[PDB]
Amino acid sequence: DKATIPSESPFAAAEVADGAIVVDIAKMKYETPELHVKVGDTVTWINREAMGHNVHFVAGVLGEAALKGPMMKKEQAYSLTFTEAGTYDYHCTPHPFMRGKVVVE
Numbered sequence: 001d002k003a004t005i006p007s008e009s010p011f012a013a014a015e016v017a018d019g020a021i022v023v024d025i026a027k028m029k030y031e032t033p034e035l036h037v038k039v040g041d042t043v044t045w046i047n048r049e050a051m052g053h054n055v056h057f058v059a060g061v062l063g064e065a066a067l068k069g070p071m072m073k074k075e076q077a078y079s080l081t082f083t084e085a086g087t088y089d090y091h092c093t094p095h096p097f098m099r100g101k102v103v104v105e
């Protein structure tokens, strides 16, 4: 696996770590569609709108299986810690026109 999951559950936006690397989700878009981080960094997505959203990496991207994140409700968050350099594309499961990528360097 090229990512670990701190919390399998979404969690509250106020519970996001001090200094987190945050991608906001609003207006049916990931607000940072191309994020560059370093090996070992944790990225946190935070849903800022009513509509449920997740992040979904298909099989072979972050590991053998697809990494289909849990649906985040409004003001919920979800983190992934990236452990290997590469380019990792993702989309939103119910709204697959929403696309982003994490580039881990």
Ligand SMILES: [Cu+]
Pocket (backbone or CB within 6 Å): 052, 053, 054, 092, 093, 094, 095, 098
């Ligand atoms: Cu979505």
